[PDB]
From Swiss-Prot, chains A, D, F, H, J, L:
This is Insulin A chain. It comes from the Eukaryota. The lineage of its organism: Eukaryota, Metazoa, Chordata, Craniata, Vertebrata. Disulfide bonds join C6-C11.
Length: 21, 30, 30, 21, 30, 21, 30, 21, 30, 21, 30, 21
Protein backbone atom coordinates (compact mmCIF):
# COMPACT_ATOMS: atom_id res chain seq x y z
CA UNK A 1 0.00 0.00 0.00
CA UNK A 2 1.05 3.66 0.23
CA UNK A 3 2.75 3.18 3.59
CA UNK A 4 4.97 0.49 2.13
CA UNK A 5 5.46 2.13 -1.29
CA UNK A 6 6.70 5.44 0.16
CA UNK A 7 9.25 3.59 2.28
CA UNK A 8 10.54 0.76 0.02
CA UNK A 9 10.40 2.83 -3.17
CA UNK A 10 9.22 6.45 -3.62
CA UNK A 11 5.91 8.20 -3.75
CA UNK A 12 4.55 11.60 -4.75
CA UNK A 13 2.56 14.20 -2.80
CA UNK A 14 -0.18 13.59 -5.37
CA UNK A 15 -0.37 9.93 -4.39
CA UNK A 16 -0.38 10.95 -0.70
CA UNK A 17 -3.30 13.32 -1.38
CA UNK A 18 -5.46 10.29 -2.12
CA UNK A 19 -5.36 9.46 1.62
CA UNK A 20 -6.87 12.74 2.74
CA UNK A 21 -10.42 12.68 4.07
CA UNK B 1 6.93 18.96 -6.09
CA UNK B 2 9.49 16.18 -5.83
CA UNK B 3 9.11 12.48 -5.16
CA UNK B 4 9.38 11.35 -1.58
CA UNK B 5 11.09 8.54 0.29
CA UNK B 6 9.19 8.36 3.57
CA UNK B 7 9.31 5.76 6.28
CA UNK B 8 7.77 5.49 9.67
CA UNK B 9 6.60 8.66 11.30
CA UNK B 10 7.91 10.74 8.31
CA UNK B 11 5.05 9.38 6.23
CA UNK B 12 2.54 10.64 8.82
CA UNK B 13 4.22 14.09 8.84
CA UNK B 14 3.91 14.21 5.06
CA UNK B 15 0.24 13.20 5.14
CA UNK B 16 -0.39 15.88 7.78
CA UNK B 17 1.19 18.60 5.55
CA UNK B 18 -0.52 17.42 2.39
CA UNK B 19 -4.04 17.02 3.88
CA UNK B 20 -4.25 19.95 6.29
CA UNK B 21 -7.69 20.44 7.82
CA UNK B 22 -9.15 17.65 5.71
CA UNK B 23 -7.22 15.16 7.83
CA UNK B 24 -6.26 11.73 6.52
CA UNK B 25 -6.21 8.04 7.19
CA UNK B 26 -3.04 6.08 7.89
CA UNK B 27 -3.41 2.46 6.91
CA UNK B 28 -0.26 0.30 6.83
CA UNK B 29 -0.25 -3.29 5.66
CA UNK B 30 -0.75 -6.00 8.28
CA UNK C 1 1.44 7.54 31.54
CA UNK C 2 0.45 11.23 31.34
CA UNK C 3 -2.10 13.73 29.88
CA UNK C 4 -0.68 16.67 27.80
CA UNK C 5 -1.81 19.05 24.90
CA UNK C 6 -1.05 17.39 21.58
CA UNK C 7 -1.68 19.60 18.56
CA UNK C 8 -1.03 19.49 14.84
CA UNK C 9 1.82 17.41 13.66
CA UNK C 10 2.53 16.45 17.28
CA UNK C 11 -0.98 15.02 17.56
CA UNK C 12 -0.54 12.82 14.48
CA UNK C 13 2.95 11.76 15.66
CA UNK C 14 1.29 10.63 18.90
CA UNK C 15 -1.44 8.73 16.97
CA UNK C 16 1.29 7.02 14.96
CA UNK C 17 3.04 6.04 18.22
CA UNK C 18 -0.11 4.75 19.89
CA UNK C 19 -1.78 3.01 16.89
CA UNK C 20 1.18 1.95 14.72
CA UNK C 21 0.27 -1.05 12.53
CA UNK C 22 -3.44 -0.84 13.45
CA UNK C 23 -3.45 2.45 11.50
CA UNK C 24 -5.51 5.50 12.52
CA UNK C 25 -7.63 8.34 11.27
CA UNK C 26 -6.94 11.98 11.89
CA UNK C 27 -10.19 13.86 11.27
CA UNK C 28 -9.99 17.34 12.72
CA UNK C 29 -13.43 18.45 11.29
CA UNK C 30 -14.44 15.73 13.54
CA UNK D 1 -13.35 15.45 18.08
CA UNK D 2 -9.69 14.54 18.52
CA UNK D 3 -8.59 18.22 18.29
CA UNK D 4 -10.97 19.29 21.01
CA UNK D 5 -10.15 16.25 23.19
CA UNK D 6 -6.34 16.28 22.81
CA UNK D 7 -5.19 19.72 21.63
CA UNK D 8 -7.74 22.20 23.00
CA UNK D 9 -8.22 20.12 26.10
CA UNK D 10 -5.83 17.40 27.35
CA UNK D 11 -5.87 13.66 26.63
CA UNK D 12 -4.07 10.50 27.66
CA UNK D 13 -2.37 7.94 25.44
CA UNK D 14 -5.33 5.67 26.19
CA UNK D 15 -7.76 8.24 24.85
CA UNK D 16 -5.63 8.61 21.73
CA UNK D 17 -6.27 4.90 21.10
CA UNK D 18 -9.85 5.94 20.41
CA UNK D 19 -8.71 7.05 16.93
CA UNK D 20 -6.93 3.89 15.97
CA UNK D 21 -8.36 1.68 13.26
CA UNK E 1 -3.77 20.54 -1.15
CA UNK E 2 -4.30 22.97 1.76
CA UNK E 3 -3.12 26.28 3.36
CA UNK E 4 -2.01 26.14 7.07
CA UNK E 5 0.37 28.07 9.50
CA UNK E 6 3.85 26.58 9.25
CA UNK E 7 6.32 27.97 11.77
CA UNK E 8 9.83 27.21 12.94
CA UNK E 9 11.04 23.72 12.57
CA UNK E 10 7.69 22.79 11.01
CA UNK E 11 8.26 25.39 8.30
CA UNK E 12 11.67 23.98 7.38
CA UNK E 13 10.29 20.41 7.49
CA UNK E 14 7.68 21.55 4.96
CA UNK E 15 10.37 23.17 2.75
CA UNK E 16 12.32 19.92 2.87
CA UNK E 17 9.16 18.02 1.81
CA UNK E 18 8.32 20.41 -1.02
CA UNK E 19 11.85 21.10 -2.38
CA UNK E 20 13.76 17.90 -1.55
CA UNK E 21 16.70 17.40 -3.95
CA UNK E 22 16.30 20.89 -5.47
CA UNK E 23 17.39 22.21 -2.05
CA UNK E 24 15.99 25.38 -0.47
CA UNK E 25 16.82 28.46 1.54
CA UNK E 26 15.28 29.36 4.84
CA UNK E 27 15.89 33.07 5.39
CA UNK E 28 13.65 34.39 8.13
CA UNK E 29 15.25 37.93 8.14
CA UNK E 30 13.88 37.79 4.74
CA UNK F 1 9.42 36.84 3.68
CA UNK F 2 8.69 33.14 4.19
CA UNK F 3 7.89 33.67 7.92
CA UNK F 4 5.36 36.36 7.19
CA UNK F 5 3.86 34.42 4.24
CA UNK F 6 3.68 30.96 5.87
CA UNK F 7 3.84 31.31 9.66
CA UNK F 8 2.30 34.71 10.46
CA UNK F 9 -0.12 34.38 7.60
CA UNK F 10 -1.02 31.12 5.81
CA UNK F 11 0.55 29.57 2.70
CA UNK F 12 0.06 26.66 0.35
CA UNK F 13 2.55 23.97 -0.62
CA UNK F 14 2.78 25.74 -3.98
CA UNK F 15 3.82 28.98 -2.31
CA UNK F 16 6.42 27.09 -0.30
CA UNK F 17 8.00 26.11 -3.64
CA UNK F 18 8.92 29.77 -3.94
CA UNK F 19 11.85 29.08 -1.57
CA UNK F 20 13.25 26.12 -3.37
CA UNK F 21 16.59 26.41 -5.14
CA UNK G 1 -0.59 0.02 22.57
CA UNK G 2 1.67 -1.51 19.94
CA UNK G 3 5.35 -2.38 19.99
CA UNK G 4 7.74 0.23 18.72
CA UNK G 5 10.79 0.31 16.48
CA UNK G 6 12.51 3.56 17.39
CA UNK G 7 15.92 4.83 16.45
CA UNK G 8 17.72 8.05 17.00
CA UNK G 9 15.64 11.08 17.78
CA UNK G 10 12.39 9.02 17.41
CA UNK G 11 13.22 7.30 20.68
CA UNK G 12 13.45 10.69 22.42
CA UNK G 13 10.08 11.74 20.92
CA UNK G 14 8.53 8.55 22.26
CA UNK G 15 10.01 9.06 25.73
CA UNK G 16 8.70 12.64 25.70
CA UNK G 17 5.12 11.44 24.88
CA UNK G 18 5.20 8.58 27.35
CA UNK G 19 6.65 10.55 30.31
CA UNK G 20 4.97 13.94 29.95
CA UNK G 21 5.61 16.29 32.86
CA UNK G 22 7.53 13.63 34.75
CA UNK G 23 10.34 13.99 32.23
CA UNK G 24 12.82 11.19 31.56
CA UNK G 25 16.43 10.23 31.20
CA UNK G 26 18.02 9.28 27.89
CA UNK G 27 20.98 7.01 28.40
CA UNK G 28 22.46 5.30 25.32
CA UNK G 29 25.27 2.77 25.52
CA UNK G 30 28.83 4.06 25.19
CA UNK H 1 20.02 -0.89 26.93
CA UNK H 2 16.64 0.59 25.97
CA UNK H 3 18.14 2.94 23.41
CA UNK H 4 19.70 0.02 21.59
CA UNK H 5 16.80 -2.42 22.11
CA UNK H 6 14.18 -0.06 20.62
CA UNK H 7 16.34 0.43 17.54
CA UNK H 8 17.83 -3.03 16.82
CA UNK H 9 14.72 -4.95 17.90
CA UNK H 10 11.42 -3.55 19.27
CA UNK H 11 10.25 -2.16 22.55
CA UNK H 12 6.97 -1.31 24.24
CA UNK H 13 5.65 1.96 25.71
CA UNK H 14 5.59 0.09 29.02
CA UNK H 15 9.33 -0.53 28.82
CA UNK H 16 9.85 3.14 27.85
CA UNK H 17 7.84 4.22 30.92
CA UNK H 18 10.61 2.82 33.10
CA UNK H 19 12.83 5.73 31.95
CA UNK H 20 10.50 8.44 33.21
CA UNK H 21 11.58 10.41 36.26
CA UNK I 1 25.34 29.61 17.17
CA UNK I 2 22.05 31.21 18.30
CA UNK I 3 19.56 31.56 21.23
CA UNK I 4 15.87 30.62 20.53
CA UNK I 5 12.73 29.33 22.49
CA UNK I 6 12.84 25.54 22.61
CA UNK I 7 9.74 23.96 24.12
CA UNK I 8 8.28 20.49 24.51
CA UNK I 9 9.30 17.93 22.02
CA UNK I 10 11.49 20.54 20.32
CA UNK I 11 13.40 21.01 23.56
CA UNK I 12 14.13 17.29 23.92
CA UNK I 13 15.06 17.07 20.20
CA UNK I 14 17.60 19.83 20.88
CA UNK I 15 18.95 17.99 23.96
CA UNK I 16 19.33 14.87 21.83
CA UNK I 17 21.25 16.91 19.22
CA UNK I 18 23.52 18.58 21.75
CA UNK I 19 24.17 15.61 24.12
CA UNK I 20 23.85 12.57 21.83
CA UNK I 21 25.85 9.62 23.21
CA UNK I 22 26.55 11.38 26.53
CA UNK I 23 22.80 11.05 27.18
CA UNK I 24 20.73 13.70 28.98
CA UNK I 25 17.95 14.28 31.46
CA UNK I 26 14.79 16.17 30.75
CA UNK I 27 13.30 17.17 34.10
CA UNK I 28 10.68 19.85 33.63
CA UNK I 29 9.60 19.87 37.36
CA UNK I 30 13.10 20.95 37.63
CA UNK J 1 14.97 24.57 35.33
CA UNK J 2 15.46 23.71 31.66
CA UNK J 3 11.86 24.78 30.79
CA UNK J 4 12.30 28.17 32.37
CA UNK J 5 15.80 28.63 30.88
CA UNK J 6 15.08 27.41 27.33
CA UNK J 7 11.33 27.54 26.65
CA UNK J 8 9.98 30.37 28.82
CA UNK J 9 13.15 32.35 28.36
CA UNK J 10 15.77 31.74 25.63
CA UNK J 11 18.89 29.57 25.74
CA UNK J 12 21.91 28.73 23.63
CA UNK J 13 23.12 25.31 22.51
CA UNK J 14 25.91 25.73 25.08
CA UNK J 15 23.39 26.19 27.87
CA UNK J 16 21.53 23.10 26.69
CA UNK J 17 24.74 21.15 27.36
CA UNK J 18 24.04 21.83 31.01
CA UNK J 19 21.50 18.96 30.91
CA UNK J 20 23.74 16.39 29.35
CA UNK J 21 24.89 13.43 31.40
CA UNK K 1 28.94 19.07 21.33
CA UNK K 2 28.97 15.60 19.82
CA UNK K 3 29.26 14.42 16.24
CA UNK K 4 26.04 13.82 14.38
CA UNK K 5 24.66 11.17 12.06
CA UNK K 6 21.83 12.92 10.27
CA UNK K 7 19.81 11.82 7.29
CA UNK K 8 16.84 13.22 5.51
CA UNK K 9 14.69 15.66 7.40
CA UNK K 10 16.89 15.24 10.56
CA UNK K 11 19.61 17.19 8.81
CA UNK K 12 17.19 20.08 8.22
CA UNK K 13 16.12 20.00 11.90
CA UNK K 14 19.76 20.21 12.92
CA UNK K 15 20.45 23.12 10.57
CA UNK K 16 17.38 24.89 11.95
CA UNK K 17 18.65 24.52 15.58
CA UNK K 18 22.21 25.47 14.73
CA UNK K 19 21.38 28.56 12.60
CA UNK K 20 18.40 30.05 14.42
CA UNK K 21 17.31 33.43 13.09
CA UNK K 22 20.19 33.52 10.64
CA UNK K 23 18.47 30.80 8.64
CA UNK K 24 20.40 28.46 6.35
CA UNK K 25 20.62 26.90 2.95
CA UNK K 26 19.96 23.22 2.28
CA UNK K 27 21.80 22.02 -0.77
CA UNK K 28 21.93 18.26 -1.41
CA UNK K 29 23.91 16.72 -4.25
CA UNK K 30 22.10 16.14 -7.53
CA UNK L 1 28.54 17.68 0.29
CA UNK L 2 27.30 18.25 3.85
CA UNK L 3 23.95 16.62 3.19
CA UNK L 4 25.66 13.44 2.09
CA UNK L 5 28.50 13.56 4.65
CA UNK L 6 26.14 13.85 7.66
CA UNK L 7 24.18 10.84 6.45
CA UNK L 8 26.83 8.42 5.09
CA UNK L 9 29.43 9.30 7.72
CA UNK L 10 29.18 11.86 10.56
CA UNK L 11 29.37 15.59 10.84
CA UNK L 12 29.73 18.21 13.56
CA UNK L 13 27.52 21.17 14.54
CA UNK L 14 30.52 23.32 13.62
CA UNK L 15 30.47 22.00 10.06
CA UNK L 16 26.69 22.56 9.95
CA UNK L 17 27.20 26.17 11.08
CA UNK L 18 28.93 26.85 7.77
CA UNK L 19 25.52 26.54 6.05
CA UNK L 20 23.88 29.31 8.03
CA UNK L 21 23.13 32.56 6.23
CL1 LIG M 1 4.47 24.04 18.28
CL1 LIG N 1 14.69 7.99 10.29
ZN1 LIG O 1 13.61 9.70 11.19
ZN1 LIG P 1 6.10 21.76 17.21
Amino acid sequence: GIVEQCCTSICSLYQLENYCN
Amino acid sequence: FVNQHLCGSHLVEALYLVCGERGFFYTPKT
